[PDB]
Amino acid sequence: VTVQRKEKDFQGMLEYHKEDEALLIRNLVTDLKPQMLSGTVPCLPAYILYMCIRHADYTNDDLKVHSLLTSTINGIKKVLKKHNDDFEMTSFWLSNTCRLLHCLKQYSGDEGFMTQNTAKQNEHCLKNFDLTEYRQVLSDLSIQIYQQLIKIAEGVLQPMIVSAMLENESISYCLEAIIRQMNAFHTVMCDQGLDPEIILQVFKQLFYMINAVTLNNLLLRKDVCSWSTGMQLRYNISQLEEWLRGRNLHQSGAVQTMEPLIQAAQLLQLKKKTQEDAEAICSLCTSLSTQQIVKILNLYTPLFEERVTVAFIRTIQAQLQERNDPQQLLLDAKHMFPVLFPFNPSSLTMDSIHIPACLNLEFLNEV
């Protein structure tokens, strides 16, 4: 005469009645300030969200799945749009979106993603629903958030680059100011548990920018080309390269993206008179185009010191004629490397995760 319920211990699922879905989204996404998770594990919102999805799957409510994910995605997008300048917030949500996607793979039920699961984790996989397509959506969203992250970061650094790389003499913005800023970026991305492979690619991208912007500026300024600026320039790059080693980012590929600017700095110092000096420049400057090498030489301005002759420059143009260099003089400073998002399953267990009171999700029931 009445369908009673079976008693069992917390299984790592979260239940809400369809009426509260708006509030869930508000307290967990829209109104969630990153600093409110000061002292918890990273990406808790991702885990919470997957616990709600498990329960939707458990009850075969395919409508509650679609509504939950669709409402979350729209929530995140709405947050990232209102905070399109905010590097913390963007990084926060890139972290949670990825971890959510990691949970949907690790707990997908597809053997291929579950090779690293513990017996107790395999229990918590989805039973009824194949959410491949939602993973594809979340994957897309993450590309977008990534691109907003690079924007914000480039937007902060760009005004600092030229003054910091060339003008300031160490041997208006100093090189230190750029390092303090990148430090702050690195520290946010770390404290929010953003995948290290993504932290690497972000700094690879920022450094390609520093390369491109500084080199373009060299290629448009006659006053700034000389051996003295080549020296300061090289020292400044070597100071950036040592920063990378200090934060363990020297394998990101960042160093490699600065090769052109390094060769421009060496070009500025090299002898440039004899046939010997011309063979060397062509041997060295493999990452500078013919036009760029030629351009830096025409702009070369001594401090007692002679200028680059026309015959010298025509001797160079002849040797590099054999190689087909691009017609564009300047680099694309806004070029964006396509990112590879890894899959990083965790060892956290759904049944040991409990929501802190500071999140205001008392209306979620632990099942």
């Binding site: 051996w227 700095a265 500025l268 110092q269």
Partner: protein, 162 residues
């Protein structure tokens, strides 16, 4: 972040190991595959002296430039290769180039590198020690490759600058 910054310069024939001495001291790395130095190269490392934080700014190298290279330098490592007697004969020339461009008060350290090459030794320690004493230079034999004495070399020269 530091309290004093000391410019220290590396000089000596090519192939005697200046760049590997730099890479061994600043980042503890060494390459058997000699990569060319081009123009002036740099590297730094914060070292402790007294209760003071000194940033060792080491310069490295492959005419106006030659003065910018020595100007301001408060220390120098003059390096040769204990396995190649020619690089040691040349030390006199490098000494003259130094004394022409650097401050009289510069602290100078003769460094016989590649001490691991004992079986190939071309420059007896005693001769080189004598030369250094004679010309007021500090002296030490290092191996960038097995790292013997590299730390002590820079430590020593930085401690004599204060």
């Amino acid at each position: 972040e530091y309290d004093y910054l000391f410019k220290v310069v590396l000089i000596g024939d090519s192939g005697v190991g200046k760049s590997n001495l730099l890479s061994r001291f600043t980042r503890n790395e060494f390459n058997l595959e000699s990569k060319s130095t081009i123009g002036v190269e740099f590297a730094t490392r914060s070292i402790q002296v007294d209760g003071k934080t000194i940033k060792a700014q080491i310069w490295d190298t492959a005419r106006a430039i030659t003065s910018a290279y020595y100007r301001g330098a408060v220390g120098a490592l003059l390096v040769y290769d204990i396995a190649k007697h020619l690089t040691y004969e040349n030390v006199e020339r490098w000494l003259k180039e130094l004394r022409d461009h650097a401050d009289s008060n510069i602290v100078i350290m003769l460094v016989g590198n590649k001490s691991d090459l004992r079986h190939l030794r071309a420059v007896p320690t005693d001769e080189a020690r004598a030369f250094a004493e004679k010309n007021g230079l500090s002296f030490i034999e290092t191996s960038a490759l097995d790292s013997t004495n590299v730390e002590a070399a820079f430590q020593t020269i930085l401690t004599e600058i204060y």
